[PDB]
Amino acid sequence: PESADLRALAKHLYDSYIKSFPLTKAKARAILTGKTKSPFVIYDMNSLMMGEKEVAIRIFQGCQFRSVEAVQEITEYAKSIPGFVNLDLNDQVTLLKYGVHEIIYTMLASLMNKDGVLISEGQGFMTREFLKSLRKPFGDFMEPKFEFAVKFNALELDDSDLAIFIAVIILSGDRPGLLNVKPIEDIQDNLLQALELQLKLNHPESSQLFAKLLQKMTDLRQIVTEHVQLLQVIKKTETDMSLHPLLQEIYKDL
Amino acid sequence: ERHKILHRLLQ
Ligand SMILES: CCCCc1nc(C)c(Cc2nc(C(C)(C)C)no2)c(=O)n1Cc1ccc(-c2ccccc2-c2noc(=O)[nH]2)cc1
């Protein structure tokens, strides 16, 4: 291992992260803290109608479009991680299949404070209470994300940090179905090393930021798991629930 | 394989 390469990798990943995800933590936080006329607050059924077939199904059918596009962008990110393009195309699929939603919820955290979540690329703000007030099991989709986002946002990671942490999540050599995990671990071990260095310089006063961040990686796996389970309860009930084929492609056998 | 959209998104 060489510090120059590890730092080259950090900077490489950051520039590629900038060039791949139009929505960064820096833009989301600038909106959330008012330093950026202003997002439209959605806190009830009526101002949801003013914000612009049941309401709960409708609040979430629109999000699919951004999910699909996040799958597109995460994929253009994974193609920039040194070594990924040469892995067996089958492992490339599996790494995106399991990685994509862990990274989405990592990025969704930037959009969240304890009180709510930015919507429509920050043109709206939908309150947590309102999401909590929805019916069926619909009003339990977002509350686990808020509890995570509050704890995760407390790490004070920035877009430099996130680029590498997200790359580490993609290069997870323990997902079901990888063909040979050996080259995946060599990439990730090295990514983990850039992270440790990255966090040690960017945050010299957060003693064990590295350990606390590794433990959030497992939190992200449980969020996806519960989320996938809630989807199963809906598919048994809501006839009005359809899913984009890319998302349906990802959720099957997950 | 059976993820054909993702397969296509990669090349
Ligand atoms: C209305 C609340 C807004 C929260 C939200 N906003 C968006 C924009 C996305 C997608 C997405 N954000 C991003 C970035 C910007 C890069 C972070 N990139 O992408 C997102 O995920 N969430 C969480 C969420 C949870 C639950 C269901 C849901 C609820 C009930 C039934 C089905 C589903 C569902 N439909 O498809 C799924 O996977 N679950 C949908 C979505």
Q: In chain A, what are the domain boundaries?
A: 1-254
Of B5, B7, B9, the CB nearest to A245: B5
Which among A75, A249, A250 has CB closest to B10?
Answer: A75
Closest C-alpha residue for ligand 1 atom 32: A60
Chain B residue with the nearest C-alpha to that of A87: B10
* Long-range contacts from A224-233, C-beta under 8 angstroms, 24+ separation: A224/A98, A224/A101, A224/A102, A224/A105, A224/A254, A226/A144, A227/A101, A227/A141, A227/A144, A228/A254, A230/A137, A230/A140, A230/A141, A233/A137
Q: How far apart are CA B7 and CA A113, in angstroms?
A: 35
What sign does the dihedral A201-A202-A208-A211 (CA atoms) show? Answer: negative
| Block residue for tokens 């850039």 | A194
Q: Say whether residue A72 is in contact with chain B using an 8 A CB cutoff.
A: yes
Q: Are A29 and A107 in contact (CB under 8 A)?
A: no
For B2, nearest residue in chain A (alpha carbons): A249
Task: Output the DSSP codes for chain A.
Answer: --HHHHHHHHHHHHHHHHTT-SS-HHHHHHHHTT----PEEE-SHHHHHHH---HHHHHHHTHHHHHHHHHHHHHHHHTTSTTGGGS-HHHHHHHHHHHHHHHHHHHHHHTEETTEEEETTTTEEEEHHHHHT-STTGGGSSHHHHHHHHHHHTT---HHHHHHHHHHHHT-TTSTT-S--HHHHHHHHHHHHHHHHHHHHH-TTSTTHHHHHHHHHHHHHHHHHHHHHHHHHHHTT-TT----HHHHHHHTT-
Contacts of B8 in chain A (CB under 8 A): none
- From first CA to last CA, the distance across chain B in angstroms is 14
- Here the tokens at position A130 are 């309102």
Residue pair A80/A20 in contact (Cβ under 8 Å)? The answer is: yes
Q: Which are the contacts of A14, defined by CB distance < 8 A and separation ≥ 6?
A: A159, A160, A163, A164
Spatial distance between the Cα atoms of A158 and A38, rounded to a whole number of angstroms: 23
Tokens 């960017």 belong to residue: A202
Q: Give, in degrees to the nearest 5, the angle at Cα A190 between A80 and A6.
A: 75
Query: DSSP 3-state assignment of B11?
Result: coil
Q: Is B4 helix (H, G, I), strand (E, B) or coil?
A: helix
Query: B1 — contact with chain A (CB < 8 Å)?
Result: yes
Phi, psi of A35 (to 5 degrees): -95, 85
Distance CA B6, CA B11 (A): 10
A88 touches chain B (CB under 8 A): no
Mutation choice for ligand 1 from A63, A232, A238, CB with most ligand atoms inside 8 A:
A63
- Say if residue A227 carries a ligand binding annotation: yes
Q: Give the resolution to one decimal, in Å.
A: 2.5
What are the backbone angles phi and psi of residue A96, rounded to the nearest 5°?
Answer: -70, -40
| Angstroms from A249 CA to nearest CA on chain B | 6
Task: Please check whether residue B8 touches A, CB under 8 A.
Answer: no
Cβ neighbours of residue A89 under 8 Å, at least 6 residues apart? B7, B10
Parallel, antiparallel or unpaired: strands A124-127 and A40-42: parallel
Q: Is A244 annotated as a binding residue?
A: no
Which residues, other chains included, contact A125 with Cβ-Cβ below 8 Å and sequence gap of 6+?
A: A39, A40, A41, A42, A116, A117, A118, A119
| Lateral strand order in the sheet of A112-113 | A40-42, A124-127, A116-119, A112-113
**Is B7 close to A89, i.e. CB distance below 8 A?**
yes
In angstroms, rounded to a whole number, what is the distance separating the alpha carbons of residues A163 and A157?
10
A66 is in an annotated binding site: yes
Distance from CA of A75 to the nearest CA of B (A): 7
Retrieve residue A26's tokens.
């820096």
Is residue A101 annotated as involved in ligand binding?
yes
**CB atoms closer than 10 angstroms to residue A189:** 13
| Amino acid present at A219 | D
A237 with A243: CB under 8 angstroms?
no
Query: B8 by DSSP, 3-state: which?
Result: helix
Q: Domain A1-254, CATH 1.10.565.10 — does that match? A: yes
A83: left (phi over 0), alpha (psi -120 to 50) or beta: left
Solved with: X-ray
The burial class, CB within 10 Å (0-12 / 13-18 / 19+), for A222 is: exposed
Q: Which residue has the tokens 């997902």?
A: A175
- CB distance A199 to A209 below 8 Å: yes
Map tokens 């590794």 to a residue. A214
